[PDB]
Amino acid sequence: STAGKVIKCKAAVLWEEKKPFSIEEVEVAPPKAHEVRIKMVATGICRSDDQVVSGTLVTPLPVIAGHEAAGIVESIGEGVTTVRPGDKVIPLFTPQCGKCRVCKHPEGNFCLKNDLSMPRGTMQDGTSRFTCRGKPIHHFLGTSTFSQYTVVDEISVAKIDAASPLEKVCLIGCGFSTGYGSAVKVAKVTQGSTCAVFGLGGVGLSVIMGCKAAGAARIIGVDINKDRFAKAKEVGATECVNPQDYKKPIQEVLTEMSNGGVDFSFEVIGRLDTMVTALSCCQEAYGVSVIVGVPPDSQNLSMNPMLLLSGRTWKGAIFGGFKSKDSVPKLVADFMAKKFALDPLITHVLPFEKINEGFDLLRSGESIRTILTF
Amino acid sequence: STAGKVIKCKAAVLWEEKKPFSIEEVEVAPPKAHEVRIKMVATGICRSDDQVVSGTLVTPLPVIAGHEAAGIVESIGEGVTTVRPGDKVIPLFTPQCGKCRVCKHPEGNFCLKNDLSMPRGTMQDGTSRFTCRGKPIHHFLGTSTFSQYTVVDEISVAKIDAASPLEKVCLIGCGFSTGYGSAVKVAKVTQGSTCAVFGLGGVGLSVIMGCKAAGAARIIGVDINKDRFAKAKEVGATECVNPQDYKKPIQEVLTEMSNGGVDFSFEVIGRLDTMVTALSCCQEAYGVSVIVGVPPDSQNLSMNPMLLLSGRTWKGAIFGGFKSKDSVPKLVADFMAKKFALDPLITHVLPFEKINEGFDLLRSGESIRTILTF
Ligand SMILES: NC(=O)c1ccc[n+]([C@@H]2O[C@H](COP(=O)([O-])OP(=O)(O)OC[C@H]3O[C@@H](n4cnc5c(N)ncnc54)[C@H](O)[C@@H]3O)[C@@H](O)[C@H]2O)c1
Numbered sequence: 001s002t003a004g005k006v007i008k009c010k011a012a013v014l015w016e017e018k019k020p021f022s023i024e025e026v027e028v029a030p031p032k033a034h035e036v037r038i039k040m041v042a043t044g045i046c047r048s049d050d051q052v053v054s055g056t057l058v059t060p061l062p063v064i065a066g067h068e069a070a071g072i073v074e075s076i077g078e079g080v081t082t083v084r085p086g087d088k089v090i091p092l093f094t095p096q097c098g099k100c101r102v103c104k105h106p107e108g109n110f111c112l113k114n115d116l117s118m119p120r121g122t123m124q125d126g127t128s129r130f131t132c133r134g135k136p137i138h139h140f141l142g143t144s145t146f147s148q149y150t151v152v153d154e155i156s157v158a159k160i161d162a163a164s165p166l167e168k169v170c171l172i173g174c175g176f177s178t179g180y181g182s183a184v185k186v187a188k189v190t191q192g193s194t195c196a197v198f199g200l201g202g203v204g205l206s207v208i209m210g211c212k213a214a215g216a217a218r219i220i221g222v223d224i225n226k227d228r229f230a231k232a233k234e235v236g237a238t239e240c241v242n243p244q245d246y247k248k249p250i251q252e253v254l255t256e257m258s259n260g261g262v263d264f265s266f267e268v269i270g271r272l273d274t275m276v277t278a279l280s281c282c283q284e285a286y287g288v289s290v291i292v293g294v295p296p297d298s299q300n301l302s303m304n305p306m307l308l309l310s311g312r313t314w315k316g317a318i319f320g321g322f323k324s325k326d327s328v329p330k331l332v333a334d335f336m337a338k339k340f341a342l343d344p345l346i347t348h349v350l351p352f353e354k355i356n357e358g359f360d361l362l363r364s365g366e367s368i369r370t371i372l373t374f
Numbered sequence: 375s376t377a378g379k380v381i382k383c384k385a386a387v388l389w390e391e392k393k394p395f396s397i398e399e400v401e402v403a404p405p406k407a408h409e410v411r412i413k414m415v416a417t418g419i420c421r422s423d424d425q426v427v428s429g430t431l432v433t434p435l436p437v438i439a440g441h442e443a444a445g446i447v448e449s450i451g452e453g454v455t456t457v458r459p460g461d462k463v464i465p466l467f468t469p470q471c472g473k474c475r476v477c478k479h480p481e482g483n484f485c486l487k488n489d490l491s492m493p494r495g496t497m498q499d500g501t502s503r504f505t506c507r508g509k510p511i512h513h514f515l516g517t518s519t520f521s522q523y524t525v526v527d528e529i530s531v532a533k534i535d536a537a538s539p540l541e542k543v544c545l546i547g548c549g550f551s552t553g554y555g556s557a558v559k560v561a562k563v564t565q566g567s568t569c570a571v572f573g574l575g576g577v578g579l580s581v582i583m584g585c586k587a588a589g590a591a592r593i594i595g596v597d598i599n600k601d602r603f604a605k606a607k608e609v610g611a612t613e614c615v616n617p618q619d620y621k622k623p624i625q626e627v628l629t630e631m632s633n634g635g636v637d638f639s640f641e642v643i644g645r646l647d648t649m650v651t652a653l654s655c656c657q658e659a660y661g662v663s664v665i666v667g668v669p670p671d672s673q674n675l676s677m678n679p680m681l682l683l684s685g686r687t688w689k690g691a692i693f694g695g696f697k698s699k700d701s702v703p704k705l706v707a708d709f710m711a712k713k714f715a716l717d718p719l720i721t722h723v724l725p726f727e728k729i730n731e732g733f734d735l736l737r738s739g740e741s742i743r744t745i746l747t748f
Pocket residue numbers: 046047048051174175178198199200201202203204222223224225228243268269270271274291292293294295317318319320368
């Protein structure tokens with residue numbers, strides 16, 4: 001019925017920075033070769049989507065944002081072989097083309113087809129599938145999940161278990177997997193280690209879950225909002241510290257708590273100063289610090305390279321280092337098997353139509369993750 | 375007939391920054407408990423010693439510098455068990471106490487008893503065994519090898535093979551091991567990888583030897599001094615590039631040459647700008663960059679953290695990541711077994727009395743390593 005035809009549906013369009021989303025009718029073109037059109041079932045509100053609104057994460061406007069979602073394939077373009085109409089799917093903000101140097105590397109996951117490094121806001125072919133008020137609307141990271149229907153390149157979608165609860169697993173599309181993988185895959189947290197986690201929102205909580213899963217003996221939560229501490233301890237933090245409580249810089253406090261520095265630190269906020277703090281708080285000879293949070297556009301940090309010379313390792317990762325198309329289905333399967341929990345991350349649920357209230361809850365600090373249902 | 379007595383001998387004293395060494399008589403006190411007095415046989419001139427003269431590496435003056443050396447034990451203090459008079463030894467600028475948390479960690483080597491982080495310029499007990507002109511002289515990194523005799527703490531000395539050529543193996547005390555281990559132990563260069571080495575002095579050449587030994591398929595030497603290329607190729611470099619030959623920044627050149635970034639980059643110069651450049655030239659998703667060069671005191675670098683978020687790993691190390699007391703005798707054994715070569719690194723061999731000439735060779739770029747003999 002809708003196959004091969006333009007679909008008119010509602011989407012949350014962001015016409016300008018620092019403005020509310022405008023929920024309105026958009027036209028969604030049918031999928032071209034190697035593209036997939038998806039009816040969205042649920043989508044998470046991630047801090048990154050808000051950074052697009054704030055303008056600290058830069059991507060071309062106007063745009064349909066949203067990148068953490070789950071849905072059902074409405075139709076496929078010519079040539080698609082990995083999903084079919086009716087399949088449950090999670091769109092991948094980091095693609096997996098499977099052919100580039102990175103996809104073929106055993107460790108890398110930042111596929112060269114990503115739209116993150118030099119964002120164009122289009123499909124892989126350099127055009128848009130979205131029209132609103134007669135004007136072309138940009139995509140975001142090849143996903144654009146703030147729409148009843150979106151179109152994504154095949155390399156940016158993964159087929160998941162047919163029995164998956166889409167209102168929970170959308171988190172595997174961003175927040176959960178990013179935090180969990182930062183701990184278990186990127187940092188490679190070891191059994192008996194001490195970890196510090198800067199930022200106790202959805203992603204930071206996921207890092208704590210990964211730290212616990214890996215067998216960390218101590219997991220120190222760091223956040224300026226003490227209301228986050230309860231849930232952090234629930235998912236595995238052994239102690240929580242608020243830097244505003246201390247007269248000395250937090251890296252000194254943590255170094256003292258850990259009796260000379262932590263084995264593993266994680267910056268999960270997106271501030272330049274906390275990236276440097278987190279690197280400093282790891283043990284100077286063998287510590288590892290992982291940058292997860294997204295820094296403000298085009299800003300450089302300043303640091304003393306002697307921090308590195310002594311032995312520290314500093315690294316960052318997108319999407320927890322997971323090769324996206326390979327891992328998402330495996331992660332969903334693991335979820336179905338009760339290997340990890342997602343409920344602790346979801347604090348609010350709202351209809352898609354209340355997306356602006358959802359962003360208000362994030363901005364206010366009230367929610368961890370709000371899931372929007374279509 | 376010197377054991378237990380003060381020794382009057384010649385040393386090269388640095389009384390002031392930016393001045394020649396003064397070759398003169400000093401008094402060397404006998405070793406106290408757990409100390410070892412060494413008659414120096416050979417000592418290398420390392421860029422780091424020149425950084426002490428330059429004032430860019432800060433340590434209390436006046437000082438007897440020198441940290442890359444080999445000699446023979448003259449006498450030992452009470453309680454020493456790992457060396458005995460007549461033993462061939464290499465002083466270790468990074469000690470191995472074997473009891474601290476770093477020493478007990480499987481990866482770390484920056485022992486907490488080091489005099490590098492916050493230099494005191496003394497023995498472990500906070501005193502000096504050197505007197506010159508009635509004035510106390512500081513030690514340098516617990517070693518001070520620019521003297522016919524020095525006294526070092528037991529944790530800062532390693533017994534080596536009785537048949538070692540001391541005029542060669544002194545390089546295992548700093549230069550060779552630092553470069554070699556940075557490749558094979560810190561970066562863990564993999565077979566068939568592409569490596570880039572910034573700085574083709576003695577340490578950079580040892581990095582190249584390590585990269586070659588690790589099975590790298592391409593090893594790109596980077597230096598502004600084209601005179602270094604020939605030797606770099608002899609020890610394993612496949613290509614050499616001079617940044618001054620190009621109109622575009624060298625990270626762009628290296629990224630193009632390596633079809634998207636190198637696997638492993640090494641900064642072996644000590645410049646803030648080349649540290650960032652070396653990081654940038656490694657592949658954005660899986661590249662690893664190792665800082666080896668010692669940067670100028672108290673200077674911060676500026677960098678865009680997106681370089682790390684995409685997947686890059688940045689680390690540094692002291693002494694090639696080798697746990698010093700454990701590795702040095704093994705490295706010497708390996709040298710005696712012809713597993714690596716040291717002759718390529720030695721370009722000049724001078725009597726100790728010509729130390730200042732030796733330093734002039736380094737500053738002018740004429741030498742790679744000059745070895746001073748006593
Ligand atoms: N690397 C990736 O692939 C990836 C994926 C998803 C999200 N992110 C990024 O991760 C970061 C965290 O996302 P999130 O959804 O958990 O965000 P969030 O806003 O829900 O959580 C951030 C937390 O940091 C805390 N915080 C703020 N300032 C702080 C300070 N000075 N010290 C300590 N804590 C402080 C806040 O109180 C909050 O609890 C964001 O920057 C987001 O863009 C990265």
